[PDB]
Amino acid sequence: RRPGRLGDPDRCLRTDPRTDPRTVEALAPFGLDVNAAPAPIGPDAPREQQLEYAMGAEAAFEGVFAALMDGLDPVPGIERRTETISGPAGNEIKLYVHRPAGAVGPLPGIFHIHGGGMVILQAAGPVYVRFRDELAATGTVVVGVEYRNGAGVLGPHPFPAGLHDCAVALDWVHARRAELGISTLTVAGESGGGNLTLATAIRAKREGRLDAIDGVYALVPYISGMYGRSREEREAELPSLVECDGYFISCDLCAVFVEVYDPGTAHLTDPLAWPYHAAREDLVGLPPHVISVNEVDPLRDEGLAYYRKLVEAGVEARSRVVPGACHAADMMFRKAAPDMYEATVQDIHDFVTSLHRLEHHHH
Amino acid sequence: RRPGRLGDPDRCLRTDPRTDPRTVEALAPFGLDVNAAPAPIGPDAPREQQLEYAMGAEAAFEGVFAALMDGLDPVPGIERRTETISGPAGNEIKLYVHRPAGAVGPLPGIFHIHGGGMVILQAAGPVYVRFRDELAATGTVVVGVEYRNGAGVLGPHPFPAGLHDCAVALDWVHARRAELGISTLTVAGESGGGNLTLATAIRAKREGRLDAIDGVYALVPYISGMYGRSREEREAELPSLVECDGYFISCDLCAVFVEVYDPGTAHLTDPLAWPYHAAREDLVGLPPHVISVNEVDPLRDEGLAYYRKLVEAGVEARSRVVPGACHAADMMFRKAAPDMYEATVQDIHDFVTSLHR
Numbered sequence: 001r002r003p004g005r006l007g008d009p010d011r012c013l014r015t016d017p018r019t020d021p022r023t024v025e026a027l028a029p030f031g032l033d034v035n036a037a038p039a040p041i042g043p044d045a046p047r048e049q050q051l052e053y054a055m056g057a058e059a060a061f062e063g064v065f066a067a068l069m070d071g072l073d074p075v076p077g078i079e080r081r082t083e084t085i086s087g088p089a090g091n092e093i094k095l096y097v098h099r100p101a102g103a104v105g106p107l108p109g110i111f112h113i114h115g116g117g118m119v120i121l122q123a124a125g126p127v128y129v130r131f132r133d134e135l136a137a138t139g140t141v142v143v144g145v146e147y148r149n150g151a152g153v154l155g156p157h158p159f160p161a162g163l164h165d166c167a168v169a170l171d172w173v174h175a176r177r178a179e180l181g182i183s184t185l186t187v188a189g190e191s192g193g194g195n196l197t198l199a200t201a202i203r204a205k206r207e208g209r210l211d212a213i214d215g216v217y218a219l220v221p222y223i224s225g226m227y228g229r230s231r232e233e234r235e236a237e238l239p240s241l242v243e244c245d246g247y248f249i250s251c252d253l254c255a256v257f258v259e260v261y262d263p264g265t266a267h268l269t270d271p272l273a274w275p276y277h278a279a280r281e282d283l284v285g286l287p288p289h290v291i292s293v294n295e296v297d298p299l300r301d302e303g304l305a306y307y308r309k310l311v312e313a314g315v316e317a318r319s320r321v322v323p324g325a326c327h328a329a330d331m332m333f334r335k336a337a338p339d340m341y342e343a344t345v346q347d348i349h350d351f352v353t354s355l356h357r358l359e360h361h362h363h
Numbered sequence: 364r365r366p367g368r369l370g371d372p373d374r375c376l377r378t379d380p381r382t383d384p385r386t387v388e389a390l391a392p393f394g395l396d397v398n399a400a401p402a403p404i405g406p407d408a409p410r411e412q413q414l415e416y417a418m419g420a421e422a423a424f425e426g427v428f429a430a431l432m433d434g435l436d437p438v439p440g441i442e443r444r445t446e447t448i449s450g451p452a453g454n455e456i457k458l459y460v461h462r463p464a465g466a467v468g469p470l471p472g473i474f475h476i477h478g479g480g481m482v483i484l485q486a487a488g489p490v491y492v493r494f495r496d497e498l499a500a501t502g503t504v505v506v507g508v509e510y511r512n513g514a515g516v517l518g519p520h521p522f523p524a525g526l527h528d529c530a531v532a533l534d535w536v537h538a539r540r541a542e543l544g545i546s547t548l549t550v551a552g553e554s555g556g557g558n559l560t561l562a563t564a565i566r567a568k569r570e571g572r573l574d575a576i577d578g579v580y581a582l583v584p585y586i587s588g589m590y591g592r593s594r595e596e597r598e599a600e601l602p603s604l605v606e607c608d609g610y611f612i613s614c615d616l617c618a619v620f621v622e623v624y625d626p627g628t629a630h631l632t633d634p635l636a637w638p639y640h641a642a643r644e645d646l647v648g649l650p651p652h653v654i655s656v657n658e659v660d661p662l663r664d665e666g667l668a669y670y671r672k673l674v675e676a677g678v679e680a681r682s683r684v685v686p687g688a689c690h691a692a693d694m695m696f697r698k699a700a701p702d703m704y705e706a707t708v709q710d711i712h713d714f715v716t717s718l719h720r
């Protein structure tokens with residue numbers, strides 16, 4: 001029969017033979033070996049209740065991530081510094097810089113955009129600190145942007161606040177490459193940070209700012225906005241949204257996050273809010289991209305769709321799949337599945353090291 | 364607004380702003396800067412006439428490839444030897460072996476399957492000798508299999524003759540990794556050799572022979588068999604078949620080649636003939652795969668489809684696109700577009716060095 005919840009509506013990560021069993025056992029303490037509990041509200045709830053729900057979801061996910069990162073041996077030899085810059089709207093934006101302490105000369109730069117559906121989680125949290133140390137350790141300079149969120153502790157700031165913060169922060173890092181010891185500059189991020197990464201490149205082309213971007217690496221991108229569509233609609237367009245619904249994340253939670261990010265959903269088909277909607281003309285001329293998708297992630301199909309769009313637009317594009325992986329498993333299970341974690345860090349290192357500096361090429 | 368011949372039916376490689384212009388000028392001596400001339404026959408022609416046509420098409424493509432390889436400095440430091448083995452059906456199969464001079468120790472192996480729609484061209488021809496030298500130079504042992512073709516000078520031998528010859532030759536290389544100085548073994552090939560590469564892996568799983576295959580690298584695979592469908596059918600299913608029809612290769616030529624390969628087309632939906640038809644159960648458990656596709660290649664969409672299938676079956680799969688590239692441009696334009704050629708050679712090298720037994 002068909003895989004996952006297409007073949008058996010009651011299947012979950014534990015009962016899906018495709019799931020890496022180490023990750024099932026790593027999620028069991030949190031109850032996330034089985035299908036996520038349903039959302040107690042939907043996208044028609046009053047905004048006040050949606051923000052309360054998102055604040056609780058933020059805390060709940062942060063508890064999971066803190067426990068998964070707890071007790072890890074430090075990454076050796078990383079220098080960390082925080083910079084604080086002026087945002088577009090009188091707001092301060094923190095940048096978390098990571099580099100190998102011994103590094104002599106310029107290294108590839110990674111402008112890292114954290115996930116959380118553009119509405120929750122902090123770049124200051126342990127799962128992101130760890131990922132930026134891990135990337136830096138390979139011989140990169142990593143700059144993690146703390147942008148305004150749609151909700152939670154760093155919210156509420158609707159679309160396009162976080163996207164504007166990412167723009168200003170990218171411009172600041174690009175203007176300081178030499179000071180920061182950066183050669184090429186890649187924008188990277190997972191899930192909602194994969195969304196902001198892809199939209200950051202689309203916007204940079206529109207604004208004449210593409211000198212800032214030598215490459216783009218999007219992991220498990222959260223880009224369709226279509227989580228609130230019926231089971232039949234989701235099955236017809238993006239079947240992974242049914243096949244793997246409730247595998248770590250659920251369409252019901254994501255549909256509330258869509259409304260939280262953009263109240264009224266005037267930008268539901270705007271490629272800067274939801275890059276799945278990008279037209280060919282939005283993508284022509286973009287720098288090299290990687291789209292990394294996860295096998296048992298509901299967001300798998302929308303990530304594959306974006307790779308097809310980039311191919312159709314002539315971008316120097318690549319894609320990969322992480323076998324056995326739930327949404328963001330390759331960034332979460334540094335303890336339980338270190339090989340999966342290492343393979344993603346090493347793929348990103350291999351991509352950024354391959355890049356040419358495009359500001360110095362005729363364009 | 365739609366690219367290529369979807370937006371302007373008269374567009375051709377030269378007038379498509381997407382094409383790498385260096386490849387346009389490189390194809391102009393052959394008249395292949397403009398849309399390929401139409402086929403004088405169709406798949407309904409008598410078999411005798413289809414074989415005459417395939418033999419002329421073979422000579423014409425060989426002439427292009429020879430001219431594109433002429434005037435190159437040889438790849439230095441390559442040792443070449445020919446092995447001759449027993450095939451499945453009393454036939455001898457040549458194997459073209461390439462290795463770097465003075466390599467110490469085992470190197471990744473590449474079992475290379477040439478293209479030509481499974482019906483034309485020889486592994487002994489200069490475009491394949493060059494590509495195997497180029498791969499060897501990066502630190503690999505390359506084995507080019509000379510299998511039975513559906514047509515041309517090494518035919519006619521319908522499906523599954525070529526596939527059977529690839530299976531026996533792969534088994535022979537696998538059994539001799541030590542003697543050949545090979546560590547890991549990758550099956551690789553472009554176009555019709557991309558078809559045979561992907562079908563070789565699906566067949567190996569069925570036959571309990573997957574120990575022979577540590578990875579699979581398919582370039583611009585020729586795998587749908589759907590070239591003879593109407594313009595409207597092709598547009599609906601695999602739009603690149605219309606968008607880039609006539610860019611170097613044409614659907615009319617390909618539709619005759621389908622019939623030549625498998626006369627009567629009993630295997631038109633058989634994944635061993637046409638891997639686009641693979642079911643999930645055919646792909647589950649396969650070793651790592653790369654699918655490389657070319658931007659302005661009519662075969663682009665079928666290759667992207669196969670990457671999706673591998674992802675949906677849990678294979679450790681990757682894909683790439685070559686911008687500005689017609690069908691097989693990354694293997695043809697070593698003179699005019701050396702950056703494009705080297706990027707494909709280095710991606711294959713990166714892949715095979717990443718594998719383990």
Ligand SMILES: [Mg+2]
Pocket residue numbers: 410519
């Ligand atoms: Mg006959």
